[PDB]
């Protein structure tokens, strides 16, 4: 199954004392007046400047950060892919599946994340003990682990680190848009292509919603903003994020 996710007028503080004070009241919040609704099986793309609250938003959904105002609604299990890849000492297989094995699911995830060719290189195949991996292999294994988990909501925080432009595109398509096409998911990204293929987009800046709605509505309701951001996707993660950050500081509020 999958869930809908709804946030209505949500405000949150990481400093729990302040969150209580604000709540009771009938520094500055990490997230302010956040609103979105994603339907079952839909993709929300979340972009924004550095420190804007993109990971914090995900942490709220996981219950690590509580709102001081507003309503969050969602049900079921959550799977989370962090923006920092991590590999535990053990086999490639163990890293992806943990303890529970489903052959058909495991095979579809390795294919979707392009891990077949990485696995096949080794004598032991996926029983190879984690051999040091490249950043890109680490990113793909971390993604595979998150997508393999049977969950009702998938939270993918910038999962495409150290990938080539073309293979990030291939994996966005095969994994996020095809394998997970019927799962509710939220993707943090800085690629315009990802925003374009999303059902909904949320742009965050200093904890506020700079824009929520559709890519074509962004093109329409934010023409001056779009005109800077739209060969952007060939730029490095760092450069895209610096351009997005600087543009947001210019046009915010
Ligand atoms: N557990 C926490 N406790 C206190 N403050 C936090 C915590 N997590 C994040 N913050 C702070 O909240 C702000 C938002 O950080 P967050 O990680 O949500 O930003 P981000 O938009 O994901 O940025 P990036 O583009 O760097 O990933 C930052 O000032 C950060 O230092
Ligand atoms: Mg983050």
From Swiss-Prot:
Changing residue 199 to G: In CF; impaired maturation of glycan chains. Changing residue 134 to I: In CF; impaired maturation of glycan chains. Changing residue 136 to D: In CF; decrease in the frequency of channel opening in vitro; decrease in channel activity and ATPase activity; complete loss of bicarbonate transport; no effect on trafficking to the cell membrane, protein stability, nor on the maturation of glycans. Residues 27-230 form the ABC transporter domain. Changing residue 147 to I: In CBAVD and CF; uncertain significance; found in cis of the IVS8 TG11-T5 allele, which affects exon 9 splicing; no effect on protein maturation, trafficking to the cell membrane, nor on channel activity. N-glycosylated. Disulfide bonds: none annotated. ATP 1 binds at residues 14, 48-55, 83. Changing residue 213 to R: In CF; impaired maturation of glycan chains. Expressed in the respiratory airway, including bronchial epithelium, and in the female reproductive tract, including oviduct (at protein level). Detected in pancreatic intercalated ducts in the exocrine tissue, on epithelial cells in intralobular striated ducts in sublingual salivary glands, on apical membranes of crypt cells throughout the small and large intestine, and on the reabsorptive duct in eccrine sweat glands. Detected on the equatorial segment of the sperm head (at protein level). Detected in nasal and bronchial superficial epithelium. Changing residue 247 to S: In CF; uncertain significance; no effect on glycan maturation and channel activity. Changing residue 218 to P: In CF; impaired maturation of glycan chains. It is found in: Apical cell membrane; Early endosome membrane; Cell membrane; Recycling endosome membrane. The modification Phosphoserine is found at residues 134, 242, 252. Changing residue 54 to A: Decreases glutathione uptake. It comes from the Eukaryota. Changing residue 198 to T: In CF; impaired maturation of glycan chains. It is linked to Cystic fibrosis: A common generalized disorder of the exocrine glands which impairs clearance of secretions in a variety of organs. It is characterized by the triad of chronic bronchopulmonary disease (with recurrent respiratory infections), pancreatic insufficiency (which leads to malabsorption and growth retardation) and elevated sweat electrolytes. It is the most common genetic disease in Caucasians, with a prevalence of about 1 in 2'000 live births. Inheritance is autosomal recessive. Monomer; does not require oligomerization for channel activity. May form oligomers in the membrane. Interacts with SLC26A3, SLC26A6 and SHANK2. Interacts with NHERF1 and MYO6. Interacts (via C-terminus) with GOPC (via PDZ domain); this promotes CFTR internalization and thereby decreases channel activity. Interacts with SLC4A7 through NHERF1. Found in a complex with MYO5B and RAB11A. Interacts with ANO1. Interacts with SLC26A8. Interacts with AHCYL1; the interaction increases CFTR activity. Interacts with CSE1L. Epithelial ion channel that plays an important role in the regulation of epithelial ion and water transport and fluid homeostasis. Mediates the transport of chloride ions across the cell membrane. Possesses an intrinsic ATPase activity and utilizes ATP to gate its channel; the passive flow of anions through the channel is gated by cycles of ATP binding and hydrolysis by the ATP-binding domains. The ion channel is also permeable to HCO(3)(-); selectivity depends on the extracellular chloride concentration. In vitro, mediates ATP-dependent glutathione flux. Binds and hydrolyzes ATP via the two cytoplasmic ABC transporter nucleotide-binding domains. The two ATP-binding domains interact with each other, forming a head-to-tail dimer. Normal ATPase activity requires interaction between the two domains. The first ABC transporter nucleotide-binding domain has no ATPase activity by itself. The PDZ-binding motif mediates interactions with GOPC and with the SLC4A7, NHERF1/EBP50 complex. Belongs to the ABC transporter superfamily. ABCC family. CFTR transporter (TC 3.A.1.202) subfamily. This is Cystic fibrosis transmembrane conductance regulator. It comes from Homo sapiens (Human). The lineage of its organism: Eukaryota, Metazoa, Chordata, Craniata, Vertebrata. The chain holds residues 389 to 671 of 1480 of the full protein.
């Amino acid at each position: 199954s999958t869930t809908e996710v709804v946030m209505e007028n949500v405000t949150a503080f990481w400093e729990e004392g302040f969150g209580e004070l604000f709540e009771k009241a009938k520094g500055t919040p990490v997230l302010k007046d956040i609103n979105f609704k994603i339907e079952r099986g839909q993709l929300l793309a979340v972009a924004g400047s550095t420190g804007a609250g993109k990971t914090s938003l995900l942490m709220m959904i996981m219950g690590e950060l509580e709102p001081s105002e507003g309503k969050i609604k969602h049900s079921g299990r959550i799977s989370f892919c962090s923006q920092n890849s991590w590999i535990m000492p053990g086999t490639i297989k163990e890293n992806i599946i943990g303890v529970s094995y489903d052959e058909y699911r495991y095979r579809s995830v390795i294919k979707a994340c392009q891990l077949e060719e990485d696995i096949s290189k080794f004598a032991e195949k996926d029983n190879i003990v984690l051999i040091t991996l490249s950043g890109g292999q680490r990113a793909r294994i971390s993604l595979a682990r998150a997508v393999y988990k049977d969950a009702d909501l998938y939270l993918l925080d910038s999962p495409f680190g150290y990938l080539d432009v073309l293979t990030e595109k291939e994996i966005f398509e095969s994994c996020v848009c095809k394998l997970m096409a019927n799962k509710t998911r939220i993707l943090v990204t800085s690629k315009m292509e990802h925003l374009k293929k999303a059902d909904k987009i949320l742009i965050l800046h200093e904890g506020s919603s700079y824009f929520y709605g559709t890519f074509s509505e962004l093109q329409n309701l934010r023409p001056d903003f779009s005109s800077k951001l739209m060969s952007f996707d060939q730029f490095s993660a760092e450069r895209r994020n610096s351009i997005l950050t600087e543009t947001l500081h210019r046009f915010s509020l």
